[PDB]
């Protein structure tokens, strides 16, 4: 409950302890929030 609808047991995007917020998955365990740089 923040602004939009909840998120089923898959799309997990929240704050890590007390830093930044990332979109971590539950079925893959991997996360998405960071972007590439070394191009």
Curated annotation (Swiss-Prot):
PTM entry text: On T-cell activation, phosphorylation by the JNK cascade on serine and threonine residues surrounding the PRR domain accelerates the ubiquitination and degradation of JUN and JUNB. The increased ITCH catalytic activity due to phosphorylation by JNK1 may occur due to a conformational change disrupting the interaction between the PRR/WW motifs domain and the HECT domain and, thus exposing the HECT domain. Phosphorylation by FYN reduces interaction with JUNB and negatively controls JUN ubiquitination and degradation. Monoubiquitinated. Autopolyubiquitinated with 'Lys-63' linkages which does not lead to protein degradation.
Compartments in which it is found: Cell membrane; Cytoplasm; Nucleus; Early endosome membrane
Residue span, WW domain: 6-38
Record-listed Phosphothreonine modification sites: 32
Expression across tissues: Widely expressed.
Disease: Autoimmune disease, multisystem, with facial dysmorphism: A disorder characterized by organomegaly, failure to thrive, developmental delay, dysmorphic features and autoimmune inflammatory cell infiltration of the lungs, liver and gut.
Functional description taken from the UniProt entry: Acts as an Acts as an E3 ubiquitin-protein ligase which accepts ubiquitin from an E2 ubiquitin-conjugating enzyme in the form of a thioester and then directly transfers the ubiquitin to targeted substrates. Catalyzes 'Lys-29'-, 'Lys-48'- and 'Lys-63'-linked ubiquitin conjugation. Involved in the control of inflammatory signaling pathways. Essential component of a ubiquitin-editing protein complex, comprising also TNFAIP3, TAX1BP1 and RNF11, that ensures the transient nature of inflammatory signaling pathways. Promotes the association of the complex after TNF stimulation.
Complex and partners: Monomer. Part of a ternary complex composed of SMAD3, ITCH/AIP4 and NEDD9/HEF1; within the complex NEDD9/HEF1 interacts (via N-terminus) with ITCH/AIP4 (via WW domains); the complex mediates ubiquitination and proteasomal degradation of NEDD9/HEF1. Interacts (via WW domains) with OCNL. Interacts (via WW domains) with NOTCH1. Interacts (via WW domains) with JUN. Interacts with JUNB; the interaction promotes ITCH-mediated ubiquitination and degradation of JUNB.
Notes on the domains: The WW domains mediate interaction with PPxY motif-containing proteins.
Name the record gives this protein: E3 ubiquitin-protein ligase Itchy homolog
Natural source organism: Homo sapiens (Human)
Residue numbers of the full-length protein present here: 359 to 392 of 903
